[PDB]
Each structure stands twice: as C-alpha cells, then as structure tokens.
Design a protein around this nucleic acid. Structure first.
Ligand SMILES: [Mg+2]
Ligand SMILES: [Mg+2]
Ligand SMILES: [Mg+2]
Ligand SMILES: [Mg+2]
Ligand SMILES: [Mg+2]
Ligand SMILES: [Mg+2]
Ligand SMILES: [Mg+2]
Ligand SMILES: [Mg+2]
Ligand SMILES: [Mg+2]
Ligand SMILES: [Mg+2]
Ligand SMILES: [Mg+2]
Ligand SMILES: [Mg+2]
Ligand SMILES: [Mg+2]
Ligand SMILES: [Mg+2]
Ligand SMILES: [Mg+2]
Ligand SMILES: [Mg+2]
Ligand SMILES: [Mg+2]
Ligand SMILES: [Mg+2]
Ligand SMILES: [Mg+2]
Ligand SMILES: [Mg+2]
Ligand SMILES: [Mg+2]
Ligand SMILES: [Mg+2]
Ligand SMILES: [Mg+2]
Ligand SMILES: [Mg+2]
Ligand SMILES: [Mg+2]
Ligand SMILES: [Mg+2]
Ligand SMILES: [Mg+2]
Ligand SMILES: [Mg+2]
Ligand SMILES: [Zn+2]
Lengths: 152, 60, 50, 207
RNA sequence: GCAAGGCUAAAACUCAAAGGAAUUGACGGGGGCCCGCACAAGCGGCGGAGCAUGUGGAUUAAUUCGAUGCAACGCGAAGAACCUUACCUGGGUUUGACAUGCACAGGACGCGUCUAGAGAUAGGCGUUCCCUUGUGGCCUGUGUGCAGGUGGUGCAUGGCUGUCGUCAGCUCGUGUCGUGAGAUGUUGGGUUAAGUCCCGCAACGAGCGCAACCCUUGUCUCAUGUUGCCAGCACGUAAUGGUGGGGACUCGUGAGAGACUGCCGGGGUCAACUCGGAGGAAGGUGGGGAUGACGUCAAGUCAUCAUGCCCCUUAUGUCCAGGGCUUCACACAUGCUACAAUGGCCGGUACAAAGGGCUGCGAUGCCGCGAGGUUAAGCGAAUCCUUAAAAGCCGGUCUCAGUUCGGAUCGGGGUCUGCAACUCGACCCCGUGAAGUCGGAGUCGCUAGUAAUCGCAGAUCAGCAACGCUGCGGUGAAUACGUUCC
C-alpha cells in the first residue's frame, strides 16, 4: 500500500521435517482449509520421491528449488503509444514463491491419477532440471532477456 | 391497510385457518413479530420511543 | 429494516436481555414466608415463589 | 431523515422506559392496551400539553402517571373530567386503574412541550421564526439549558414550495451519548397541510 | 489599383441585451502533495449448462401495485391454497363488513335445520334485565347527517430511509479590509486516521465536526456455588458429576485494576509529533459494533402510518365462491448444483458456539429401508428436549470414464399441515438418469482468524426458508517491492 510495507506472517517448523520449506509447500497446496489433507499429499509425494531416489526428500527439494530458481521477471509498463516489457531483478523470497507456485500449478494439471504421485514426479523432474517448472523458468528467462534494451 | 380487512381479521372466521396476524398499531399483515404483535416499522418506532420493557438497541 | 420501503440494506438490531438470579433455598419458616408474601417488588422485576 | 432518536440512542444507558411491566405471554395484549390508551390520551386531551406518558402494570393492576403542564384542565371541575377519563380507562382496560398527575416543573425546558407550544402557535398562525425566537430565549432564561435546537419543516407559511429550516444556540452535541438531550416531536395543524416540529434540548452531560 | 483589393460609407429588419473589472463555486487530458482491493502480487467467482427468485417484453381474467444506474432487480414481500388480496368472472349488501347527533319503535342477540358455491335469506327456540311508566345500555326499518377508497397528486407533504459518506470538513460572534459581492480568520512550516496539535500571522474566540464517554471481545483481582464445576474425599449406581461433600478451578454476572505514547533512548523550534525499547492480554485508537456534519439527488415511500386539493357514494364502499398474484417464442440480475480421484460409496469414529421450546421441545419403546405415526416421562427451562455436529481420522471398493461425477426431467408408490395441495406446498421409496468435462470478449469480492470451505440456530409461518435474510462456530492460507499507470 501507500503507507509503507506490511510485515509477512511467520511460519512454524514441521516436527517431521524441521524446515520452513515443507510448511511453505503445504501452505501453497492448501485449498478449502484442509491443512491436514495438504500435509498428507505432500508427505505421500515426499515418501514416493524418497522411495524412488534414496536421498533425503528435503535435499531433493532443495536441489529442485535451486534448479528452478529464476533470476529476472518481465513486468510490463506502458508509456506512450505502445506497451513493452521491462526486465527487472527478483528478490530471493519472491523468486522462491514464484517457483513454488509454478511447480504446484504444473503438478495440478499433469496426466496422472492422484496428487501424491503427481507431486512426487513434479519434484523429481524439478530436481533433475527437466520438468514443466524448469521449462517455464527457461521461457521466462529468455523472453525477459529478449527485452534487455528497455531496462529503465 | 384497510379497516374493513382489519375488522374481517379481528372477527371470528369460518374455516379458522383463514385467520392471520397483523400489526397492533397500524394493521400491517406482514413483518408482525408474535412476541410483540406489531409490524416491523411500528416496532422500530416503538423501540426508538422506548415504550417496550426490555427492548433497546443492541451492540456487540 | 430502518427504511419503511425498499431499502433492505439499512437494518437496525435490538437486544432483549433478561436477568435471573436469587435461586436461594431459604427455609419455609412461617414468619419469613408471611413477610415475603406481604412485601411486593416493583413490576420491572417478576417474583416467582417455588 | 438521517439523525437517530436521541432517546433511543441513550436508551439502556441513561434514560428510562415510558411503560413498565413484566409479561412473557401477555406482551401482545399489554402492547395493544398501551397503544389504545395512548391513542385515547392523544385524542381529545391534546390541548393539555401531553409531554410524558408513563404506564405501569403491577400484578393485573394498571397504574397511569401522566405529566402535564396544567393539572387543572386534566382534573376538570374538581374531579369530573379526570373521573370520566378514568372511567373510560377502566372500560378500555377491564382492570383497576390508578391515574395520577404529579406535576410539570416548567413547560419551557421540556421537549414535546416546547414543541407543542410552537405547534399551537403555528396552528393559530403566528410567525414561525418569531415563535422560534421566543421559545429559544425562554429556554435560555431557563436555568439549566446549555443548548436548544428546534427544527421547522414544511410549507412554512402557506408557501407551495416546502422548506426545512432550523436555528440553534449553545451546544447540541448529538454525537455525545453521555450527554442528556430532551427530544420531542409534534406536528402543527395548518390550513395548507401541517408542519412537523422537532426539539433537542441539551441540559448538561450527566447527573 | 494590372489584379487582389484599399478608402469614404448606409438602410430596412431583428433583440433587450451585448460588454468591462472583481468574488464565490465548479470544471481541466494545468502545477504541488496525500489517500482508497483503487492500481499492482495472488486467492476464490460470474458471464458457458441445469435449478430457485426478482425484472423487461408477450399472452390472458388479473398476471393488483410501486420501485429503474452505481444508491431498483432473494427490493417493498421476516412465508401468495381461499384467507393475505388491494386483480378477473359471477352473485349478494348498500346510511353500509365499522364508530356517532337527530327524529320512531322494540328486540338486539346465542344454537341447529333445510335454500344457496358461501356470502345472504326463513321456517323452531330462550328473551325487552333495564321499573321501552320516565331517565339509562343495545339494535332492527324510513332515513337524515356520515362511514368508507390499496383512486390520484412524494413536483403540496410530515415522519422514516437510501446516496455522496464515517466524507473531515462546513460555519458563526466580535473586530479588521473593500462602494460592493466578498476576504481575514480557514494563510505559511512541521504533525495527525482526522480543521489532531505545535511555532508565526488582523486577527481574537466559538459551534456542527474528530477521538472520548455507550456496547462486545482480549489478562488478572474481589464476590458468588445453583440447575454449573470436581481440588483433597466418601459413593463407584451406569461410570451419563449419578449423590453427599468442597469454593480448590473454569464458568456464569456484579464491582475494579490494566493499555491512556504510562516510562526510557535518539530525533524533532526544546513544541506537536515521529521511530524503537522494558513491564505486559494487548502500543500507540488493543480489535470490532452503535455513533451518518452543513446539504444534495423536486431520490423513495399518498401502498407502515399520517396529511392539504380533486374524484364515486345502487359505487372507485363492502362481502362471498372459483381463478389469477406462480403464464412463456425470449433477455437481464442475484444465489445453488456440478463438470470429479483435494474425489464418490460402505463400516466405524472425536471435538462447538449461539439460539428455540404448554396451540410447544416429544427423553426413551414400538411400526415402517425410509420421511413419518403411536403411548408416554422430564422441561416456563445451566438440571428436559433440541443434541447426531459436518469438515477431521482409519480399512475396502471404484481407476480418469459423461464415470460408483452430475441430479434436471419423467413414470409409479407413500408421509406431514391445511375443510380442501391439478393450478396451489414440503418431505420420503423405486426406477428412468439431460446438459455439463472449467465457461468467449468481458466482469465480481477479498490483506488475518480475512478470503476459502463445512455445518448450526432465529424471524416470518398450520404447511411452504439445509438456493433468501440475520447471527453462530470449526479448519484455515499466499501476496503487499512500489503509487507511474485505470
Ligand atoms: Mg398464518
Ligand atoms: Mg470561480
Ligand atoms: Mg492487481
Ligand atoms: Mg461462472
Ligand atoms: Mg455463463
Ligand atoms: Mg413488475
Ligand atoms: Mg438480499
Ligand atoms: Mg377469497
Ligand atoms: Mg387471492
Ligand atoms: Mg385519498
Ligand atoms: Mg419526492
Ligand atoms: Mg478551505
Ligand atoms: Mg474563507
Ligand atoms: Mg476542530
Ligand atoms: Mg465519535
Ligand atoms: Mg420524485
Ligand atoms: Mg417514486
Ligand atoms: Mg399515506
Ligand atoms: Mg411475483
Ligand atoms: Mg438464492
Ligand atoms: Mg452419486
Ligand atoms: Mg459415513
Ligand atoms: Mg423403525
Ligand atoms: Mg476427465
Ligand atoms: Mg455432453
Ligand atoms: Mg448423473
Ligand atoms: Mg476465460
Ligand atoms: Mg420457520
Ligand atoms: Zn405497524
């Protein structure tokens, strides 16, 4: 708003996985107030990923988010008779939020049966750097880099 | 409304289910609260005038 | 509804409070019960002997 | 219009009720009885200056306490008009009735009495601003009146175009619900219709 | 004067203004500042399909009527079978379905019967109490004045209400300045959610304004122990506090403390105030509700009610019996349902608040798959009912399909209220099982216990409200870098 910033609400660390990250994904996939259901889906996906790989699910998630972390956005502006996109830098928190939203959205509309295996496959693809979120990040990066001339 | 309809309601009706409740101040047949027997607008005016024991403005 | 016509969004609410207490189990001594039935409280409060 | 009733606003805080009874099932009957007897008081007894009407019901017994400026007109010719009014009252209620007139201290600090006087002046066709000024100066001559607001609305002198005007003096803090305001509403009967009168009298914050 | 055209220069006719300065207001795609789910980041929808409600148009006997941008469209209307009802057809009444003055008399009245669709009409009854001797109450017939209208005029109106708008400014007294309208105060610099305050100022003061006092919620203390609770015990019916016992505890409802920039650090004309800290339930207004200034929209309401002028009085008054207010080639607006696997079904299973209750809440028990019916105890209620909370959790099935998704339509069969349910009610059982697969351009709401989601209760009411309204509770998020942009 016009009257300065608004502090962001804090989060708690999950007893099962002591990191704010897992709570962040639960919050992002939470819909209709079913926090327990979101936790169940994320735990099933993480257990599936651990079953398929062997390494720690939080480490796989960290690899995935580091791979899908973007650098610049393409926020647009209009001055006169035309509108053009302006590539600007992104803060780490905003980049993490955008990548998590992209991952969740692409896992929601995948061609599988349940979100356990859907999110397991999505996080594994993001960890290996070949998934839908990675493709979206590459597209955003290149289409923003194509507008480097208008960098005011 | 109509005083003829008021008298018709007040009288003892054949096929008693034909009866109905109206306002005790103006005879409005709608929005009549059985606790008081007045219509909605008359009830509001009476509450503002403060002539109902126990009825007053609510804030919560 | 605050308005007499067509303005449904103008509403005023009212509360009817009623306070109950003094449910004591005082003994039915004849002198005190006669005194109690002889004394009378203002009509704003309702007495009920059980 | 857009201003709420001061009496209702301060109801349950400072002011009291004009009808005291305790009925759970007989509420509708008591309300009908009260409105009927109030209609009876309003009709015919208008010139007595009806300011306050108090109704009390104590265990199937009707107590009536009417505040009027001149108890003489109510009492009539040594208990004749009052006796007839009480007889009509018992005929209407079906129960024993006590009708007692206590006093009115002064009909210039009282709302629904200043308004009644102004309405009478307009009915007998005196200048409305002149009556306004007379009532206001009398309220100032009254000892505890820190502000009196009177509003005149209507045709205001037979004019086809109705207009709404008011004067004020002192303080009339309608937003101060801790304050004490005497509010009254009466209508003046004119030959081209009628004129409604509202009076707000501010008599200090609180006792 | 080569020309363009320059110079001198009228009239008829037309209108009562054309104009010059300055003031206020408003406006600007002018300048400066600030703010708002207003922009931006996201969350969930509408517009696509079906259903419910209101509207326009068409039909008809009426589809009574009003409302028409935001601020009308689940509005008036918090409950249309006749009743409501004000509309249509037909039939009655007509000094009247109702209240009074004046001339007369006596019944008025309560019941059943047949006439009638009922309204209305008479055949049989009791009777005039009042000293109809006179006064006194009541009513019929001639009436006479009158009653009556939901007929109109909200552009004659009062009251009430919406809107700008919880917008923070709007004015007055004295003085001063100018012929005057008018200005000043209300300007200038900080400051606030705020014309809140601070320092100067031909200004000095004040009112309506702001916060505040009213109510709810957030901590503790004192008081209180029943119908509420069970700390140390007895009692263990039945473990359903069931009983004594207890004020240990919540809790209930009476009174206070506390949170008011209170204190400190730096800053700020040292003042306003700003930023951060300790103690705390809460920090700057702890959160919210009530609280709506001068006035505007000739805004709405002659249909809550009331009111001036006109309009009828065998009728535009009134009643009754049916119909209609619920129609239907279409469009709009507001809500619900889905289009599924965050899911459907089967079995088990735990945790609420706030309300309602003698024309009632129907604890159990029985009948019925079922809604419902029967006898019946307790309950004017912290002891009784409502009362089972659903979302939440576990095991199996289904395996992305117009489907174990979807419940619109239709046939058959029952229950409840109502004299009466085709019009014209709700619910229950079986079977049949449509569109719909995320919705075009466009468009709506939302910053914290918010949006999102799931259930509960009330009001209207005999039945019609688990799709409207008002409140209650559970789980419960992501974004705000910034004010250039609508
Ligand atoms: Mg009814
Ligand atoms: Mg100007
Ligand atoms: Mg945006
Ligand atoms: Mg939609
Ligand atoms: Mg659509
Ligand atoms: Mg219409
Ligand atoms: Mg609505
Ligand atoms: Mg009818
Ligand atoms: Mg009808
Ligand atoms: Mg009329
Ligand atoms: Mg108007
Ligand atoms: Mg100004
Ligand atoms: Mg000025
Ligand atoms: Mg001020
Ligand atoms: Mg205030
Ligand atoms: Mg108008
Ligand atoms: Mg209108
Ligand atoms: Mg009217
Ligand atoms: Mg309709
Ligand atoms: Mg709806
Ligand atoms: Mg199904
Ligand atoms: Mg189940
Ligand atoms: Mg059974
Ligand atoms: Mg599919
Ligand atoms: Mg299809
Ligand atoms: Mg289906
Ligand atoms: Mg779309
Ligand atoms: Mg109901
Ligand atoms: Zn009424």
């Amino acid at each position: 708003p016009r009257k300065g910033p608004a502090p962001k609400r804090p989060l708690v660390n999950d007893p099962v996985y002591g990191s704010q990250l897992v709570t962040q994904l639960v919050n992002k996939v939470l819909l209709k107030g079913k926090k327990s259901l979101a936790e169940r889906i994320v735990y099933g996906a993480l257990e599936q990923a651990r079953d398929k790989t062997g390494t720690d699910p939080v480490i796989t998630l960290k690899r995935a988010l580091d791979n899908v972390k973007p650098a610049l956005e393409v926020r647009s502006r209009r001055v006169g008779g035309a509108t053009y996109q302006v590539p600007v830098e992104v803060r780490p928190d905003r980049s993490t939020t955008l990548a998590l939203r992209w991952l969740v959205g692409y896992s929601r509309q995948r061609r599988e049966k349940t979100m356990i295996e859907r999110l397991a496959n999505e996080i594994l693809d993001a960890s290996n750097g070949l998934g839908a979120s990675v493709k979206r990040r590459e597209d955003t990066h290149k289409m923003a880099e194509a507008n480097r001339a208008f960098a005011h | 409304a109509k005083k003829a309809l008021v008298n018709k309601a007040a009288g003892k009706p054949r096929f008693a289910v034909r009866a109905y409740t109206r306002c005790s101040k103006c005879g409005r047949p709608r929005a009549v609260y059985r606790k008081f027997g007045l219509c909605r607008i008359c009830l509001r005016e009476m509450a503002h005038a403060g002539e109902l024991p126990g009825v007053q403005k609510s804030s919560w | 509804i605050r308005s007499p016509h067509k303005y449904k969004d103008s509403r005023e609410h009212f509360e009817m409070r009623t306070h109950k207490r003094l449910i004591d189990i005082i003994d039915p001594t004849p002198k005190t019960v006669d005194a109690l039935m002889r004394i009378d409280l203002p009509a704003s409060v309702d007495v009920n002997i059980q | 219009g857009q201003k709420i009733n001061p009496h209702g606003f301060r109801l349950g805080i400072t002011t009291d009720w004009k009808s005291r009874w305790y009925a759970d099932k007989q509420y509708a009957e008591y309300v009908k009885e009260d409105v009927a007897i109030r209609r009876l008081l309003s009709s015919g007894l208008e010139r007595a200056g009806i300011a306050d009407v108090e109704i009390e019901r104590t265990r199937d017994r009707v107590r009536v306490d009417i505040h009027t400026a001149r108890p003489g007109i109510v009492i009539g010719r040594r208990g004749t008009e009052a006796d007839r009014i009480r007889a009509d009252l018992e005929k209407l209620t079906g129960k024993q009735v006590q009708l007692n007139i206590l006093e009115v201290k002064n009909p210039e600090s009282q709302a629904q009495l200043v308004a009644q006087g102004v309405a009478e002046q307009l009915s007998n066709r005196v200048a409305f601003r002149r009556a306004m000024r007379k009532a206001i100066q009398s309220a100032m001559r009254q000892p505890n009146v820190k502000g009196i607001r009177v509003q005149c609305s209507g045709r205001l002198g037979g004019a086809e175009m109705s207009r709404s005007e008011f004067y004020r003096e002192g303080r009339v803090p309608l937003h101060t619900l801790r304050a004490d305001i005497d509010y009254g509403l009466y209508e003046a009967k004119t030959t081209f219709g009628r004129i409604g009168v509202k009076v707000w009298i501010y008599k200090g914050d609180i006792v």
